[PDB]
Amino acid sequence: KRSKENLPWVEKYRPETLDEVYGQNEVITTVRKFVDEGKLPHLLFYGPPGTGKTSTIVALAREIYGKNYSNMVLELNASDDRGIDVVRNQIKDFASTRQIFSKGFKLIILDEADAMTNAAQNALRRVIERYTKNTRFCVLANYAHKLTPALLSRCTRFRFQPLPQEAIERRIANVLVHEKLKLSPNAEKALIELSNGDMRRVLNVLQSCKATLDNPDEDEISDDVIYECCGAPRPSDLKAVLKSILEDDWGTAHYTLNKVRSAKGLALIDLIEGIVKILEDYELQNEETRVHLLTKLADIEYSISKGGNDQIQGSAVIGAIKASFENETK
Amino acid sequence: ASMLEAKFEEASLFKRIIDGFKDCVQLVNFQCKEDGIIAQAVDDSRVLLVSLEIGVEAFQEYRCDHPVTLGMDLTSLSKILRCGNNTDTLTLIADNTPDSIILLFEDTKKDRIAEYSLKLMDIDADFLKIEELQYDSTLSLPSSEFSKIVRDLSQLSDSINIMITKETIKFVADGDIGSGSVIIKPFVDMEHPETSIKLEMDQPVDLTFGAKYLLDIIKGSSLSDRVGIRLSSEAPALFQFDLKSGFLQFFLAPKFND
Amino acid sequence: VVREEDKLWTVKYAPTNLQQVCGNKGSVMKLKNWLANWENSKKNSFKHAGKDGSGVFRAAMLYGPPGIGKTTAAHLVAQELGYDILEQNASDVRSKTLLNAGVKNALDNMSVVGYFKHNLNGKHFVIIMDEVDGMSGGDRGGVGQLAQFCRKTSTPLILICNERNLPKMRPFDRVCLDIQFRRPDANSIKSRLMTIAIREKFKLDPNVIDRLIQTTRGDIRQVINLLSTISTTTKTINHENINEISKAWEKNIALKPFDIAHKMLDGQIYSDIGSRNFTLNDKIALYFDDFDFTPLMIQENYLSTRPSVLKPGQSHLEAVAEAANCISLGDIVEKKIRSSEQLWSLLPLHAVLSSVYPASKVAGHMAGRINFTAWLGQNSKSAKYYRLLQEIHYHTRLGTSTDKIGLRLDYLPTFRKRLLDPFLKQGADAISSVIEVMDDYYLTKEDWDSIMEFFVGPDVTTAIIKKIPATVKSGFTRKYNSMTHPVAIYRT
Amino acid sequence: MSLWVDKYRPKSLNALSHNEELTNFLKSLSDQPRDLPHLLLYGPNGTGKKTRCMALLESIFGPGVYRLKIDVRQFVTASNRKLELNVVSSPYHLEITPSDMGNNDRIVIQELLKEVAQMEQVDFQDSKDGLAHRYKCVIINEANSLTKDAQAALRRTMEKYSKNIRLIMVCDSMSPIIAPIKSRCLLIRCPAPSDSEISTILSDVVTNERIQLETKDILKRIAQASNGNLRVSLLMLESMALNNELALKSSSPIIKPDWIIVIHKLTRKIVKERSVNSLIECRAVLYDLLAHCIPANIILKELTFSLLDVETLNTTNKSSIIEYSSVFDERLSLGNKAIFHLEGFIAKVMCCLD
Amino acid sequence: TLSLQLPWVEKYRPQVLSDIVGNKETIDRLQQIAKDGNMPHMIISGMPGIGKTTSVHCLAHELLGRSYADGVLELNASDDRGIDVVRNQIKHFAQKKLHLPPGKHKIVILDEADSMTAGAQQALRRTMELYSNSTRFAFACNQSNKIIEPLQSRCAILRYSKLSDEDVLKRLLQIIKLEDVKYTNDGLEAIIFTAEGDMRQAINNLQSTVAGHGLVNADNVFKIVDSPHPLIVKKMLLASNLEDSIQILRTDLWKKGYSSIDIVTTSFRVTKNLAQVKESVRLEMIKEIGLTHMRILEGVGTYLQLASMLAKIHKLNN
DNA sequence: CCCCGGGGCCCCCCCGGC
DNA sequence: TTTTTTCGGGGGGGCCCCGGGG
Ligand SMILES: Nc1ncnc2c1ncn2[C@@H]1O[C@H](COP(=O)(O)OP(=O)(O)OP(O)(O)=S)[C@@H](O)[C@H]1O
Ligand SMILES: Nc1ncnc2c1ncn2[C@@H]1O[C@H](COP(=O)(O)OP(=O)(O)OP(O)(O)=S)[C@@H](O)[C@H]1O
Ligand SMILES: Nc1ncnc2c1ncn2[C@@H]1O[C@H](COP(=O)(O)OP(=O)(O)OP(O)(O)=S)[C@@H](O)[C@H]1O
Ligand SMILES: Nc1nc2c(ncn2[C@@H]2O[C@H](COP(=O)(O)OP(=O)(O)O)[C@@H](O)[C@H]2O)c(=O)[nH]1
Ligand SMILES: [Mg+2]
Ligand SMILES: [Mg+2]
Ligand SMILES: [Mg+2]
C-alpha cells in the first residue's frame, strides 16, 4: 500500500467521481438530477459484472456527503454477515438515528444483495418503509431472480448495460495517456472484441500486454501481442479451420485443426466459440442445419466443461459441423 | 524497541482504558506522537464515536520519534492485557514500519518478564476532526449515579429520553410493562465535592437515545468519578470521562424524532 | 363485566354440557367410560382389561381434525367426573427440564386447591396436555418425557393432538388409548346453526347450511366465524350468494399424501377442459403441498392405474416406460438438489420430472387402493443389513482378502456349507467342527445368526434353521458359551 | 480350518504363480524402494491385486507387514455426529477404506491421512541398504468408490508429504477416478489369470487337501465358469468338494450363487412375460435383491449380460438392450434411488422385446 | 444536497378506509366492522402493494381512536417474533387491563405473518382463545398457506385481489391533481401497464418520472421504467421461426445485460403460465428448460446454451 | 469468602419454490 | 392408509462461568 502505482489497473483506475463513469450516460444523468434537487428515491442497480455499479454508487455517496462519506453511509456486502439479526439490529439502528457529523439524510448500500437470504430481505421491507423520511437504500445486483418481489416493489430500478464500444475506447485512451503506451487500431479492435463489455477484462489484458513488451516506452501493442498474452485464436486461424471443415475431406480437416492448434497451443473451447460467432452470421437455407449446429455444439461445450478427451472432442466438432451442413443441399 | 517506547507505571490503567470502550468498537487506530497517544473509532452501526486521548504525563517514561499509526483489534488487545499482573509495569514498544506491537510486563521485585506480541492490522481510517460546538446545556454528575439510572431505565425500554430544563434534569423511559422517570436537580455540598450535580443551561433540550448505547457508554465510569454530559439540539450528545492526563469521549447520535 | 354482545359467538355458544357437543358421540362415551373406570383399573394395576378393552391404558389420546371439539369434550368430561384439571398447552414451556420439574411432580401429588374446595375424586389431577402436535423438538422437546409418563402416572392423563400420524408422535405408538374425533355430520350441526341464526336475527336457509358445512370441511368454529362475518353486513343468505360466500371462505388446505396421489393420477385434470380448469400451476402447487412424499407416492402408484390419456397407438407399457424414464431423471435432479451446492432453486423442475409428467403419462382411474411408499422401509432394511455386513466383514478381516461386497457375493455362500450344512447333515456331531471355523474367523454366535439371514432365493435358511431339533441348537449354544474364544478388534 | 482360498494365499512375490511379467515389474519397483512413487493398481475383481500389494510391501519392508491389528478411530462432523472408522494397521503400513464413511469419507482424508502425512517417521527401521526406512505406506481400498471431494482433498496431501508417506490404491476400474489423481499415480494393470494358471492353482489346492479327482477336466470347467475370477474359482472348488463328500466327479454340477439364480429367474420372467403386472413383480424381486446387500450396479450388469445370452432374442433386441443398459448405468452413476433406474431399465427392455 | 423529498407512497398513504381503492366488498366490510365494532380475528392475504397493511392500520386507527397508542401492538418481520416473544410479550399485552369504549378491544397486528415460525404460531392458539374477550388478532400476509390451519380456523379470511386499471388510474389522477403533475394519456397508460396492478410501483414510477423528466408521457415513462423482460421472454418462446427467437434473445435480452440464469428462470415461469399452448408441449419445453437451467447452474452460462435451448423448443413445437 | 444475575458458547431441530 | 440423504441459516433449549453484590 505504498503508492497508487503498486495497485492493479482494475483498482488503480476506479472512477472517483460520477464524471469518470463511462457508458452509463442515462443512469448517471438521472441519478445526478435526482441528487441535485434532493429527490433521491430508493435505488436498485441491476447489471452484469464490471459495468460500474459499485463505482457509480460510491461516486454518488461522495457527491452527496463529500470526502468523509465512509463515516456517513452504511455499506454492507457479501463479505460481511447480513443475516436477519444484522438487519434487525445494525441496519435498524443506523436507519433510525441521526448522523453524527452532518444533519443530512442517511444512505445504506447493500452491495451484492442477491446473496442475501430471503428472511433478511423480508425483514428489510418494514425497515425501508418505516424510515423513508430520513433514510434511503441502494441495492446492487447481477441476478434479479434472487430478489424478493416485495423488495423489488419498493425500489426504482436502473439497468447497467454492457459497456458500449465508445466508452471503452475513451477509457483506453485515458489509460494509454496515463501509462505512456501505444495501441494499434487493430489491437484496440481485438481488445474491445474480447472484452465483451467488461472494463475489468480490458484493464487486465492491457496491463498484461504492457508487461509483455520488451521496451514499453517505444514498443507498440499490436494484435499479435494481444493474442499472444491472452493465448486466443486469431481470426485467420478460425477462418482457416472453418474453411477446412466445410470444404475439405476428413483427413485434411483433422490435420488442419491439429496443426492450427499446435502452432500456438490454442484451446478447443476458444475455437468452438469463435466458430459459433462466425457461423451466427451465415445465411442458412434450412433451419435444421442451425438446430443441429446449436444442439451439438452446446453438447460439446458442456462435455468440455467437465474435462474429457480433447482429440475426441475436436473430431466431434468437425463431424457435427459436417453433418449439420450436409442438410443445406436438400 | 527503538521508535516508540511508552511505559505505564501501573499496567492496570491501560487495561481499564481499553475496557472502557472495548464493547463499543473493535478495530481502532492508535496514533502515537511526541505529545502522547490519540485514538478515534466509529461503531459498526455508525451511531457512536469513541475518542481517547492520553498525554505524556500518564506515562512514567514516553518516547516517540515520528508519528506512528497502530491498527489493533480491541478483543486481542484486551486478551493480551488480561495476562498482566497489577504489580507489573507495562511497556508498549514499536519499531519503524511496524507489523506488530510489543507489550512487556515487568515485575522487578520478582524479576519476572512477560513479553507478548500483537500483529497490527491495516485500517483505512482518517482521524475526523471533532469540531467543537457551543452546546445548549452542559451538566456534570457522579458516574455511579448515572450508571445506576441508565441500568434501571434500560429494564423498561430500549430508548431513554433526557430532558434538560431550567434547574431540572429528567430521564424518562416508556415500555411494554410500564414507565419510569427520574428527576434530579443541581445540588452542591461543600463538605463532599464529589456527589454534587452541576448544570449550566442555555436552551432547554429534549433528546432520545438508544438504551444499549448508553449501557455501553456507562462502562467508562471505572475511569473517572464524574461524567460530563453536553447536550444540544441538532448535534451529538457528548459523554466525557476525565483521566489524569487525557480523557475518553463518546459522541452519541440522538434518534430521529419521527 | 364484559358485555355479552362483545363476545365471539364461538365463546357465547360454547358447549356447557357433554350432551351439548355435536358429533363424535361414540368417542365421547368411550372417553367418559375410560375416565370413570380409571380408579377400578388402578386397583387392578391396569392389568384386567374391561368390556371395552380400556383397562390397560392409563392415559387417553384424543386426536382428530381442527375445530371438532376435542378440547371442550376433554374439559367437560374432566369436570363431570369431579376431577381437578391441570392443563398445559403450547403457550407454556414443556421441554425436558420444565416437564421434569413441573408436571412430573404432579403425577402423584394431591391438589391443594382440590383440598380447599372440598366427591371422592376432587383432590386428584387429570393432566390435559393439549396441542402436543405443537411440541417441537426431539429428545429434549419433552415428547419423550410425556410418552414415558404415559407409562408411569398415578392419575388420569389426557393428550390432545391433531396429526397423530406424525413422526414426532412415534414415541406414543402404543402408550395410550386412542380416541378418534371425525368431521361431524351436517345433521348434528344443523340444529345448533339454526338456533344461532334464530338468536342472531338474520335469514339462514336450511339448505344453505349443508353447503356452508361442506365449505368449512367439518369445522364448526369456522362455520360460526363465517356466519358472523356474513351476517355483519349481508343478513340475507339466499341462494343468489351461495357461490360467492363459498368461494370467499374456501380454506386453503394442504392435501395429504394419499389425496395428493389420488388427485395427481386422475385422468380428468389432464384433459383439455380439465387442464383449463386445473392448470399446470395447480399441479405444481399440489406437488409442493408435500414435496418430500409426493414423488415417492407417484413412483409407488404409477403402475396400478387404468390409463385414460393414452395416445392413439400407444399401449399401457410404453406409457409406463416413459413415466419410469422421467422418474429416473427426476431422481437425478433430486440428487443434484440435496448436495453440497444446495441447489434448491431446481425444486419446481423436480416437481415436473418426478410427479407431474409421469402422472400425466399414465393418468386414469385407479385399479385398486392407493398404497403408501414401500421405499422407506426397504431403505431401512438395506441399511440394517449393510451395517451387519460391515460388522461381519471387520470381524473376519484378518483371515480373508476381499471387500465387504466381495464377502457377501463370494465368501458367504461357501461359509454356509461349513457353518449350517454340517448341522443339517451330521447333527450334534457337527458342533465342534463348526466352532473351529467360527474360531478361525473371529465369528460370534450373533455373527452366525446374522450370516444365516443374508441368503435369498433358493438358499433361504429360515425354515431350514427352524427345522433343526432344539437339542442341537441348545448344544451349540452351551458349547460356545463353555469355552474361551479369540477377539479381533480388542478396543482399549 | 481356514477356507482354502485364504489358507493357500501367497505371502511373497516369489510365491506368486501367475502373471510373471507383473511379478517382474513389481520386483523392479521394489529393488530401490526409496524413490517409489504412489501406486494405483487397477484390474478385474478377484485377480490378486491385494495379494500383490501385500507381497510388494513384504518385499520392501519384510514379513512383519503381515502382523495386522485393527483399531478404531473417532471422527466428528460439522453437526457433531460421531463416526467410527475401522483401521487395519501394521508396524510398517496402514490400511483404510474411506468409502465406509460414505459422503463423510472426505473427513478421513482431511484429518486422518493428513495427520499421518504430517507426522515424520522416527523409528529406526533398518532396511536392506543399511539406512532406516523413511516413509510409511497407506493403502486405500475401493479407491474407485471415493467421492470427488475426497479425491480432490487427496491431491496436495500426496504432493506435499511424499517424503513421509506413499499411497497404494487398488481399484476394479479407473473410470470413477478423477484425472488429477491418475496423473499423480503410477498406474499398474493387473490382468486376470489364464484358465491354465487357474487350473494349476486348483490342482495344487486339490493335491494339498487330498481331494479325490476323477479327471482334470473338472478344474478346467470351474476355471471357465469363474470367468477369470480366482477367488470365485477357489470358493467354488471348496463348495463343490464339500457338497460331494470331498470327491468330485465328472458329472458334478457347477454351484452358482443365490443372487445369480435370482437374477437368472428374473431374466427368464422378463423374457417370458412383458406386462405391467410382470413389471410390479420384477420391482418386488429387485427390492428383495437390494435389501440383502446386492449392489445395484452388479444387478444391472448381471441382468444385462444374462439377457444378452438368451437365445430367442434377435440382433435388434440385443442392440436395444445394450443401449438401454448403457444409458441406465450412467443414470445409476448419477443417481441416488437405484430401484428407480433399475425399474426404468426393465420397463424399456420389456417395451423393446414387444 | 442533503435534503430528501418525501415519497408520494408515504405522503399520500390512505388514512381512512374511504381512500382505499379496489376490493370494494372487503373495504366495505372493514368499514362496517369499524363503525359497529366487535372486530373478529382476521387474516388478510394478497399480492404486494395492494393495500393490506394500509387497510389494517386504518381499521385499527378508526376503531381505537385516541387509545391507539395503548391498545395496539404491532409486530412485523423487522421485529423479533420468536417463541419467547409470543409466550411473554404478546401474552402480557393480551392480559393487560385497559378500559375501552363499550364495543372495542385491543388489537395485535402481526404484519407479514407468513414469515413466523411454526412454534410461534402454535403458541398463539391458546393466547387467542383465552383472551378473545379483550384482544383480537389481525394477520397480514402474502401467502395464506404459510399460516397453520389451527390459526386459520380461528380467523376470518379476507382475501385481496389485484387492483384493476380503473382504480389505479383514479388514484394516479387524484395524486396528479394534488401534486400538479403535467401528464399525457399515453404516459399514464404506460405507467399502469408497467405497474401490473401494484399501486406502490405505479406511484413510485410516476414520482420518479416527474423528478427525472417532469412531463409524464410514454417516452419518459419507458425511459424510467424498462419494458418487462417476462413479456420479451414470452415473445421469444412463441416466435414462429427459430431465427426470430434467436434474434430476440441476442438483441433484447443478451445485449441488454440480462444474465443467463434470469433468462432461463423467466422462461421456465412463462412456459409454466402459457395456457395458450397444450399442456404436453409445455411439459416438454419445461423439461428442455430444466436441462438448460441445470447446465447453467453447473457454470456453463453461455449464449450458446440458450440458443440450443431455443432450438430444441422450436423442434418440439414443430 | 460465598451466592446470584446474566452475558457467552454449545448442542440440537427444522426449512429450503412461486 | 404410513414414514430417507446435505450446507447454511435460523431458532431455541441447555448449560457454563465471569463478574458483582452481600
Ligand atoms: N463505467 C466504468 N467506467 C470506468 N471504469 C469502469 C466502469 N465500470 C467498471 N469499470 C472498471 O472496472 C472496475 C470495477 O468496476 P465496478 O464498479 O466494481 O463494476 P461492478 O458492476 O460493481 O462489478 P460486480 O457487479 O461486483 S461483478 C472499476 O474500478 C473500474 O476500473
Ligand atoms: N362439537 C362442537 N359442538 C359445538 N361447538 C363446537 C364443536 N366443536 C367446536 N365447536 C365450536 O368451536 C369452538 C372451539 O371448539 P374446540 O373445542 O376448541 O375444538 P378443537 O378441536 O379443540 O380445536 P383445535 O384442535 O384446538 S384447532 C367451541 O367453543 C365451539 O363454539
Ligand atoms: N388500495 C390502495 N389505495 C391507495 N394506495 C395504495 C393502495 N395500495 C397501496 N397503496 C399505496 O402504496 C403504498 C403501499 O401500500 P401497502 O399497504 O404497504 O401494500 P402491501 O399490501 O402492504 O404490500 P406488501 O404485501 O407488505 S409487499 C401505500 O402507502 C399507499 O400509498
Ligand atoms: N496360488 C496363487 N493364488 C493367488 C495368486 N494371486 C491371487 N491368488 C488367490 O486369489 C485370492 C483372491 O485374490 P485377491 O488378492 O483378493 O484379488 P483382488 O480382489 O483383485 O484384490 C486370494 O485369496 C489368493 O488366494 C497367485 O499368484 N498364486
Ligand atoms: Mg460491485
Ligand atoms: Mg384443542
Ligand atoms: Mg405491507
Author numbering:
A (entry chain C): 7 to 336
B (entry chain F): -1 to 256
C (entry chain A): 290 to 407, 413 to 786
D (entry chain E): 1 to 354
E (entry chain B): 4 to 321
What does the report in the manuscript say about this coordinate set?
The DNA sliding clamp proliferating cell nuclear antigen (PCNA) is an essential co-factor for many eukaryotic DNA metabolic enzymes. PCNA is loaded around DNA by the ATP-dependent clamp loader replication factor C (RFC), which acts at single-stranded (ss)/double-stranded DNA (dsDNA) junctions harboring a recessed 3’ end (3’ ss/dsDNA junctions) and at DNA nicks.
The inward movement of PCNAC disengages it from RFC. In the closed and intermediate states, the double-stranded region of the DNA is resolved extending from the bottom of the central chamber of RFC through to PCNA, while the 5’ overhang on the template strand passes through the opening between the AAA+ and A’ domains of Rfc1. Binding to RFC:PCNA partially melts the double-stranded region of the DNA near the junction and we resolve density for unpaired bases on the primer strand that extend into an opening between the AAA + domains of Rfc1 and Rfc4 that is continuous with the bulk solvent. The last paired base of the double-stranded region of the primer strand binds to the side chain of Rfc1-Trp638, which serves a role analogous to the separation pin of helicases. Notably, ATPγS remains actively coordinated in all four RFC catalytic sites in the closed PCNA state, demonstrating that PCNA closure is not mechanistically coupled to ATP hydrolysis.
